[PDB]
Amino acid sequence: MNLEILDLSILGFYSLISSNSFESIAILVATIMPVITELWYNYSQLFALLYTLIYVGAVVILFVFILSVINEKESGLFILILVLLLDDLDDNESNDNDYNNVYITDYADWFNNYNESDLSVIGNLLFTEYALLLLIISFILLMSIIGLILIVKKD
Amino acid sequence: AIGDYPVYYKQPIRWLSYHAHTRPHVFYAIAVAALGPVFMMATPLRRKFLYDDHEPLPANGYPLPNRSRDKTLTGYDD
Amino acid sequence: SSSIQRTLRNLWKNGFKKSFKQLQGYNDIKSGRLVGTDSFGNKFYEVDDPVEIHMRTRFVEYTGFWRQD
Amino acid sequence: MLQDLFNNYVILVGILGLIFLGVNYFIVESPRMDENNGNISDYIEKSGPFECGFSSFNPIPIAFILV
Amino acid sequence: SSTHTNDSLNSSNYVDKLKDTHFVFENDKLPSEIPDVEEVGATTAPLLSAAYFIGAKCQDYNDDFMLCQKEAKGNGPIDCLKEGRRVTRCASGVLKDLNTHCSDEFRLHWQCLSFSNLEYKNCRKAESLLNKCVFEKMNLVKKIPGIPEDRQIHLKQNPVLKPVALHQDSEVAFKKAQNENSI
Amino acid sequence: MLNNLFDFIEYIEYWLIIVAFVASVLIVVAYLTVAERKTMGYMQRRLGPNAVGYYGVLMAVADALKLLSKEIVLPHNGDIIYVMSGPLISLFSVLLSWAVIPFGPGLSLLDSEYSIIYLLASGSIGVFGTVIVGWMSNSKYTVLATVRTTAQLISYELVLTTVVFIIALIVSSLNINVIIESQYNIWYIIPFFPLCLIFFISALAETARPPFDNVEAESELVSGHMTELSASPFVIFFLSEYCSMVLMSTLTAIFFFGGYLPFSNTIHHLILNLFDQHSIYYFIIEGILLSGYLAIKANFFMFSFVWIRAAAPRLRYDLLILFCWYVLLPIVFAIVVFAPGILYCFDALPVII
Amino acid sequence: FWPMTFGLACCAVEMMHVSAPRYDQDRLGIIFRASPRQSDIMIVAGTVTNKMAPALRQVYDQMPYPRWVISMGSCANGGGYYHYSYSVVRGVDRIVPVDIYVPGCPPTSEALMYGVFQLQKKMMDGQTHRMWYRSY
Amino acid sequence: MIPFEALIPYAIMFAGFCLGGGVMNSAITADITKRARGPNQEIKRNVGEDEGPRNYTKPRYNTDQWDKYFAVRDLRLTGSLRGQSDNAVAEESFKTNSIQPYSNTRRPWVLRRHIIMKNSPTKWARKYSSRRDEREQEIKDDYIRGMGE
Amino acid sequence: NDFYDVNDFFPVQVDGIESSLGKYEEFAKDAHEWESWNLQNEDHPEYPVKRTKIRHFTLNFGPQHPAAHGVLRLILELHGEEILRSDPHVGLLHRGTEKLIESKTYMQALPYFDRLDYV
Amino acid sequence: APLQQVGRHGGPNKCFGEFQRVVECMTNAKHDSYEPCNNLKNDYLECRKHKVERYKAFLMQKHAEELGKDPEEIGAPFVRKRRFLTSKTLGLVDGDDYEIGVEKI
Amino acid sequence: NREKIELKREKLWARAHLMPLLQAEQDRNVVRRTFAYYKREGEIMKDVPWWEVKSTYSNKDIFHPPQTVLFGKHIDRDSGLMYANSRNRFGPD
């Protein structure tokens, strides 16, 4: 009984009935949280946190910052339910039946006596192996800092 | 020159003092950050007068002896 | 004047019953020489401690336990 | 390693949240008990904005938006 | 590190639920033609205690097993099984020897490690007793390769990092031998 | 039945550990409100609440029971969502941040090499929880202090985040236990005294406590963002505010004052020398000492939160934004490069053991 | 017991002196709350002019139940000195129900505390949940 | 003049941390040690007359990827993730009781069930176009065609 | 006016608009749909922009404020956070002292003066 | 040449060894064409996805039905709950079916 | 910091000596399961004369263990609480 499915069904409903910009912002948070939680379990815990620190902590509270400076103004129920029920029939984004319905395993090895976190490897590669990517990204962030001022600052 | 803004290519010492009295948050911020590279470039003085570097950590798997297998190895058999 | 030295001295002289009455309405365990009671029954005390502040040298102990008027 | 203990903690806080919601709906005296004058929805005077008593009718600067 | 992998038990049962993880047993055994061997039956604390003593006694056999892997060219698990039994038998030799020669000092050490998060820095006193007893019965000396002799960490007289909580048995056994053996 | 009882506790003991843990935090949080008025009372030659419970001990419970049992003001008949999301998100955000604080060696509900990120990530959610309070619920006083609020706890979240990372850079670990256990021979108050001031200044501003208290600017915005809130929505939000004051007080002790580590190891060993290590009585006393060592340190900042409130006037809002960006940020971005330079110069790049 | 800072006139000075260190209303659990929503009492202190009376009703009606009103001083009680004024409400009881009247000009800081205590003695006499069982 | 009345709230806050620390330290240590006493409840809870002093085992923090393998190894040896056993030779059960987790490898539910997040040019090709599968089916089919020859 | 409100570059005379398939007037009755055929640029200072006069944020620093030393409806008109115009509304405490003194003696009028300033 | 397929600890992962033999085969000078390296590339994709191996499991599951074989007697016994890896199931001689401790290591 | 590096050096070598001992047992676990798989595959596909029993890897000089299995008995199916009434893994119930 995967309770993750129910939450998305709710979000798949309020997205269709969203009326004002309050609803759309709440869609973003209600999309991030199923992303963050399903990543905290299952695949990668490091990036479940890296989402919260950057997505919610930087952009989403900047979404609601600007939205307060924008505006605040202002089929039925059977069609919305019918749309969801037909949309819910197929939910296999892939079509490799063998790859979906067969489970696998990996065999652990004791060679890596130097156990380290996944972030240490990323730092060990992003700062040495792919330093150019890091230095270009710094350059892009420099462009934005100069870019954001010129657009907004009237003088 | 009662309170004139110092010229940076004429009075380097007095130009520093202007930004040390009137903009304290800028002058002393850079100075703390300046010690970073300054101490980094002073490392070759430490490698000869204070102590020598440690040996690198064995983070490359099991150290494999640079030889061939020993045929004569026996014992602990079946 | 507010430290535990004064409270413990006033706790021991008064006994448990009188002090626990002061720990129910007064919120400050105090002791003093009884100066008599009125017709209604309130007991009027005066404090001889050299530590009490200017306005707290005369107090009362009402007849009631839960409510004081 | 092993976060089953943390998982139960997350469940407990979530369950504890409803207890904050629900306890008021049960402890408070009903409208008829205090003055009966009206429900929250009906009592528009109470269920209205506060403006220091007198009725009234964020274009923030560039810098605040720029920060 | 603690990242969810597909090879060992993950963080919580919810992780197992999302992945529909099945923990599968195999009821077979090794085929008859593969000779049998008695696996080492020690847990984490005994091994961490005896990791260096296993190295001294089995140094020639650890290297051959790992050299066999390199010379197998990716076919290690099938081409180094005979070498794999040599390492297991030598490792069982040390655990048995520590059990019939230095049994008291051995348990005092790894029980200290179980008491202090398996960190080697928290059980120096229970380790100095074990090293002296092993050197007088098995000729095995702990050594950390790469650095000078007088810079090995376990010989530091005033280590900067000491345990927060002192093991009582370690202190009692140290003081019991403080005056008796080390007059 | 004793066979179905002894194993029954074996099926419920860890739930009780959390409940014991939950009550442990709430008791500190509940009595911080009482301790605030008392501490802020004598400092002002007042007395503080001493007539609600014996010596005023039952003062927080009176306020909790009073507020929880009031009429709840609602925009409509079934419009509870709007006046609950703001307080609930803020409460859960700071309640989940307690899953990482270790009461001793490995005495944390969550232990992972990403404790710092999880602690900082949960801080961001509470920031987003607060801006919901002043949103769309008319516009009289809550929406005035929501662009003001958001522009404050956004900016200092930069300075607070950098300070945390600079400490984590020194130990090369993001695990709070490693950070605590690595301060054995030194407390980061000695080398990083400027950071502790910067951390505490940012800790105050994030929680919106005075002097950086223009969120609920009492003389300017009545009750600030809580002027609409009443009864249970007020309790949840108010409880959210003080849990941060406990948490930020505890975090300061964890990072700069060594966490649960004893003040003196000589006294610490003498006390633990009296209890036999084979009886569980030793491990009850050990937890009390280490937690008490953390509590005394965390007490001083909880005292400091009230102390600063009783001696410093409020800071004008525009100078708050010009403060962190012009002053605190360049300093915190300079020690983030001063620290690696020194560590590498003497060949002391940290590792995780 | 969280009143609302509705100081209007010279009676408001005494309401501040209760919070002063000599009397320290905070010791009794009294914390003035500015907003009506957060305040369950409303100490109407000072003259209630006609120009204020409509505004006073708006502030009173916003207090969630339960709610009490204390009338301090002569002006709030029955008109006081300005009883014969063209622009003074003669007693705030024409506008909001009152639960206790504190007499004075201004009532001494102890008189207000006595008025607070008497109202407290009334609140401890509330029998709402027994009323449902026995009178309803 | 130290006001002891103001120090009363701090004493309870001091006891606030103690209750959490005292219970958590003693309960977690007590349980961990109890589960290492044996592979069964009949020996976990029964204090032995012939046993020595009880040696406890404090909880482990700052674990790494080896400890996860160690815990499973101890589980297959002594029926607990932190069992104690320094026998030279493991039991006969240890030979054939290895536990290997088999799990699925499907994409997160939010990826394939959000009304918006599941729509992209390449995701529609995966979901509604047979061109990817027709090619990748031939490799699977060649496995059985290339046996008899 | 009361409810809503309505140059540097040279005023450039351009007439005789033509396309490659006719004249401006030939397709005039059809070009309203074609947004690329409009002849009124939106950057022009003379371009007709009719916007309602939405009043600025006028917070009431009203009677129920702790900062107030009485009952002051300080009608503050602010754009952003700066102060544009302030119109204090005194009178919320006009007890009519000057009217009452005229009917009382010189000794009876003294207590009125202690009630002017409370401190 | 840039690294690909780096495991979580900084070294080669499971499928890097099969990736290197493709690169060595392609860039070698002895090969007239890339025909020799066709099987080496098929193994690398096999390592990452196991699609051919999963297909062989689909047939075995499908084929076991048509002969009436039951998965209870051919399949590999498994335990689905991590708290029920009991010492009796683990094969310990004295072990008993009580739940094992997985609350906190 | 210079202390934590020397301690780290000790920790790395402690695992270095244990690595051959632990990896040898792990190799015998992979070998057993690999042989156990082809014992299963041969059973099911015994009546197919043309079938070959071989791994899905074309390169035959590199050991690639299987990573798929056919699930069988649900051992903890009948489990309630606190007592997994585990079905007898070997043979019938």
Ligand SMILES: CCCCCCCCCCCCCCCCCC(=O)OC[C@H](COP(=O)(O)OCCN)OC(=O)CCCCCCCCCCCCCCCCC
């Ligand atoms: C802690 C949980 C608290 C949940 C509070 C709200 C519960 C209602 C269910 C919303 C969650 C479903 C996911 C969709 C996101 C919300 C989009 C939306 O339309 O919300 C509608 C909400 C209820 O109003 P309603 O009457 O149902 O709709 C018409 C309103 N004129 O009206 C609103 O606009 C919401 C007003 C409050 C907004 C707060 C921020 C959004 C909630 C963020 C935390 C919840 C995280 C998502 C949880 C569900 C995940 C699927």
Ligand code: SF4
């Ligand atoms: S009753 Fe007296 S003191 Fe009070 S407001 Fe009226 S004139 Fe002033």
